[PDB]
Amino acid sequence: RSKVAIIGAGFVGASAAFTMALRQTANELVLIDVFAIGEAMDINHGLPFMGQMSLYDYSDVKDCDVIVVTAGATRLDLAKKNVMIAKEVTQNIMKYYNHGVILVVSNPVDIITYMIQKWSGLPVGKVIGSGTVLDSIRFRYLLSEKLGVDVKNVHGYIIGEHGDSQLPLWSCTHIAGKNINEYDKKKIAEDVKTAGATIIKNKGATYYGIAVSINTIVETLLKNQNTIRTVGTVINGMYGIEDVAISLPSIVNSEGVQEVLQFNLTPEEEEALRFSAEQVKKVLNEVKN
Numbered sequence: 353r354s355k356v357a358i359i360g361a362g363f364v365g366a367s368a369a370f371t372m373a374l375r376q377t378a379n380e381l382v383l384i385d386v387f388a389i390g391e392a393m394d395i396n397h398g399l400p401f402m403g404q405m406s407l408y409d410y411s412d413v414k415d416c417d418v419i420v421v422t423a424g425a426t427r428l429d430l431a432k433k434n435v436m437i438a439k440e441v442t443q444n445i446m447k448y449y450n451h452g453v454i455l456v457v458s459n460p461v462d463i464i465t466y467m468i469q470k471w472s473g474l475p476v477g478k479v480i481g482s483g484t485v486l487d488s489i490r491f492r493y494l495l496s497e498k499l500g501v502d503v504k505n506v507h508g509y510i511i512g513e514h515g516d517s518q519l520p521l522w523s524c525t526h527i528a529g530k531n532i533n534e535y536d537k538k539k540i541a542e543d544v545k546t547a548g549a550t551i552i553k554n555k556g557a558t559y560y561g562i563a564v565s566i567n568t569i570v571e572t573l574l575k576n577q578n579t580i581r582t583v584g585t586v587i588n589g590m591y592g593i594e595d596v597a598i599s600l601p602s603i604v605n606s607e608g609v610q611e612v613l614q615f616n617l618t619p620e621e622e623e624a625l626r627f628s629a630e631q632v633k634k635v636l637n638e639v640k641n
Contacts, residue, residue, distance in 0.1 A: 355380040360422035361388040367563030376404045410444040416452040424458035442471035456481040465584040466597030477608040481584025483599035484510045486565040488582040494540045512628035519624040576605040
């Protein structure tokens with residue numbers, strides 16, 4: 353039934369694949385590369401794919417339900433660097449692009465997601481970035497793992513730009529229906545935006561957390577379970593936010609975004625969110641070339 357194609361066999365492309373290979377998230381998985389085959393063979397060593405077939409070229413984006421872009425590599429230069437790589441990938445993908453939902457993972461995700469959405473000339477509801485999906489996940493986790501409660505009842509989201517301007521939706525965070533007003537927690541928010549930085553310091557890279565994130569999202573899309581995820585979408589006309597890609601809780605499925613939940617945010621939160629958009633917008637101006 354399902355078929356996912358991952359663009360880029362880097363540690364991320366590889367991990368991702370390896371993860372949705374153990375979890376056997378899709379029926380078919382393709383490793384499109386940009387330098388690949390060997391990375392697929394090593395994964396195929398743990399052979400029991402009683403529900404998956406891992407293969408190795410862009411002409412295979414045909415009939416894909418999802419297409420993940422992990423390609424990518426003095427910061428703002430990175431963006432501009434990645435934008436170049438991205439632009440080329442977008443061309444090739446679209447050369448054979450047919451039915452499918454594109455998931456952007458390349459960093460700076462917020463920027464590339466938007467850019468790629470344009471480059472492809474695809475509906476805004478079909479191109480999605482991994483956005484703050486992982487951040488929101490960890491956000492709920494930290495909460496539960498600190499209030500003696502389990503993530504099961506923990507309902508919270510991390511919206512905005514997947515960077516430093518991100519903000520936690522406290523006004524819409526409830527434990528089984530209990531506001532965060534129990535009896536302070538400005539740390540939980542911190543550890544969520546510090547995680548990436550700290551990891552990069554020690555390991556000097558990051559790809560396991562993302563690989564998982566990808567798996568998650570791919571699973572969400574393939575299930576069509578109306579699950580809410582703070583994935584990145586090109587927003588235009590919300591909270592006064594215009595042309596720019598940003599994360600917001602939205603119900604997605606194998607065929608695009610269904611709707612980007614229009615939560616009622618407090619004035620401070622609407623401010624924060626708006627501000628956040630401005631950061632991404634700054635970089636976008638630099639790009640768009």
